[PDB]
């Protein structure tokens, strides 16, 4: 009897903190886009 | 007093708000991406925690299995043969029920993050939808103010006003599209490895069903010539 290997079968991981860390500072930066009007 | 004056602090104000509407929404997809990010890592981790330990297991089984057909071919009495068989089939079955629990935990555990993940797509779209709808509506408002002051010029208050909304606005469209975009990376690579491990799952559970059935295959046809 041969089984094969059933080591073929691989689970992958992700890798998005580039992303994750981007939309938090974005978050933040748009603090920078109010709008702070002169008087007339 | 001055009424076109009156007509920005109507804008401003209102656009200020709906900025930090925007920020909180993306504050929170972004604590929500990170959660799917760690769960789908600790599946995957489990996942490949589990095949290479039944790996080991499946090539002792058949170890044994090969050893057992070996000495039938030999020819040595059937009392101790038996014995070691029985014990085997005992051994595999305790091998098999427990991994039935172990699967079911993960097919559970695998189908929860896939569940999140799809909600997460859906509640993104949803915003991105209404978001540029907003955006649109505030542009479309940007870009009638100008109309009233025609006969105006660098160093007029009101001027300098229009002239920072717009700023402030196309300032925020940039970070707005931004964001849009490093969501909807994460999201895809979030799907692409779900995608993966939910497949490779489910091979896992299809060729683990197979090896069990050639393994009993096998064992039954020692079990009928030991007579």
């Known amino acids: ?40 | 007093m001055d009424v076109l004056y009156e007509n920005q602090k109507l804008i401003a104000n209102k656009f200020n708000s709906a900025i930090g509407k925007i920020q909180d929404s993306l504050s929170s997809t972004a604590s929500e991406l990170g959660k799917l990010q760690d769960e789908v890592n600790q599946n995957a981790q489990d996942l490949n925690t589990l095949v290479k330990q039944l790996s080991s297991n499946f090539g002792r089984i058949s170890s044994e299995l090969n050893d057992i057909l070996s000495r039938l071919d030999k020819g040595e009495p059937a009392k101790d043969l038996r014995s070691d068989i029985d014990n085997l089939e005992s051994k595999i079955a305790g091998f098999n029920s427990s991994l039935q629990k172990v699967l079911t935990n993960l097919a559970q555990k695998n189908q929860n993050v896939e569940d999140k993940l799809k909600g997460l797509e859906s509640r993104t779209s949803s915003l991105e939808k209404q978001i540029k709808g907003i955006a649109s509506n505030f542009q479309n408002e940007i870009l009638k103010q100008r109309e009233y002051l025609v006969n105006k010029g660098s160093g007029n208050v009101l001027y300098e006003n229009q002239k920072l909304i717009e700023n402030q606005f196309n300032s925020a469209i940039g970070k707005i599209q931004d964001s849009l975009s490093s969501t909807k990376s994460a999201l895809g690579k979030l799907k692409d490895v779900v995608n993966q491990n939910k497949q490779a799952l489910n091979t896992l559970v299809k060729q683990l069903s197979s090896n069990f059935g050639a393994i009993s295959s096998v064992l039954n046809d020692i079990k009928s010539r030991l007579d």
């Open chain 1, 1 to 40: 009897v041969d089984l094969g290997d059933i080591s073929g079968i691989n689970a992958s991981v992700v890798n998005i903190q580039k992303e994750i860390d981007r939309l938090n500072e974005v978050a933040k930066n748009l603090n920078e886009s109010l709008i702070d009007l002169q008087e007339s």
